[PDB]
Ligand SMILES: CCn1c(-c2cc(N3CCN(C4CC4)CC3)cnc2[C@H](C)OC)c2c3cc(ccc31)-c1csc(n1)C[C@H](NC(=O)[C@H]1[C@@H]3COC[C@@H]31)C(=O)N1CCC[C@H](N1)C(=O)OCC(C)(C)C2
């Protein structure tokens with residue numbers, strides 16, 4: 592399974608690096624989309640985009656690099672692509688899963704769980720998990736709120752694939 | 755100070771609850787889809803010559819969280835029950851919202867307005883006559899709206915305030 596990283600910044604100040612294992616063995620199409628968006632090899636991707644929704648006790652959501660307002664994003668397969676499978680569950684903190692607006696609407700938005708979110712099982716495609724730097728994701732919660740609006744700009748300052 | 759009215763906007767996902775509310779508050783049409791978690795707004799208005807403050811709660815249509823609606827139904831004074839005229843399922847969902855509000859309030863006499871939104875669209879599947887008949891059986895007003903053209907937007911929120919005033 593491939594590994595990717597995000598270097599997180601807060602109002603332009605470094606916070607730290609989070610790394611992810613992508614479950615290409617179980618969700619290869621979904622893992623590949625996230626991997627390519629993290630390297631930027633298609634000429635677009637996550638670099639410079641923000642975590643627009645952070646809800647303490649639940650998750651951190653980001654990935655809208657086309658509209659920068661929580662409604663956008665696109666995959667490497669087209670604006671949206673189908674749900675690959677729901678094999679993996681939202682079992683606890685660190686799970687990496689696809690955001691969507693209903694069935695078969697995966698784009699580039701994703702979320703990282705900071706707790707178990709089992710009611711999302713069967714509705715959101717789980718495709719990876721945090722490998723290193725979970726404390727960075729935990730540190731992002733203090734910039735969130737009940738309805739997810741953030742109090743500082745939380746950005747992916749850099750991202751890429753690890754050897 | 756002016757009277758404050760606590761209004762709650764409910765209905766199925768995508769019927770236009772937020773688009774209607776943002777048109778009222780900000781005079782702007784949201785064409786993109788930004789599904790709501792929870793948002794609150796305030797606006798002062800003049801209704802029948804009396805100035806008042808609208809405190810509007812814009813709720814999520816997500817069916818997964820239907821059991822979490824009780825608290826805001828307890829607090830709300832009046833409800834805008836919104837469906838989309840091109841979405842028969844959203845019209846069927848209305849009965850479920852009214853029954854939920856009736857159960858939480860334990861009353862048949864709750865200030866409500868039925869709102870048929872997206873009347874600008876040519877693809878109508880819910881007839882005006884069906885919705886008028888449903889509102890009549892509930893004893894509430896029915897108003898057709900478009901968040902895109904602003905047709906009926908003020909009227910729907912103003913009518914809900916008039917319903918609250920008549921009830922209290
Ligand atoms: C009822 C309130 N409420 C809650 C919630 C629920 C709970 N519980 C439920 C579980 N109970 C246990 C069983 C007992 C305990 C109490 C507590 N407190 C809350 C919040 C804090 O009260 C304000 C939520 C929640 C979620 C939504 C709407 C309302 C919600 C909602 C709207 S849109 C969406 N969900 C999916 C969304 N879609 C888009 O963003 C589309 C945008 C357009 O196209 C691309 C992009 C998406 O993919 N994600 C990625 C996945 C996490 C998800 N967002 C999100 O934010 O979940 C937030 C949250 C807090 C996890 C859930």
Ligand SMILES: Nc1nc2c(ncn2[C@@H]2O[C@H](COP(=O)(O)OP(=O)(O)NP(=O)(O)O)[C@@H](O)[C@H]2O)c(=O)[nH]1
Pocket residue numbers: 765766767768769770771772773774784785786787788789790791813814815816871872873874875899900901902903
């Ligand atoms: N043509 C037209 N489109 C509308 C109208 N009202 C809303 N829409 C569109 O319908 C979509 C959903 O609207 P939105 O207000 O977000 O719906 P909501 O009921 O608040 N959804 P949620 O429950 O997820 O928060 C958006 O693309 C919006 O532009 C309307 O009167 N006419």
Ligand SMILES: [Mg+2]
Pocket residue numbers: 771772773788789790812813814
């Ligand atoms: Mg909304």
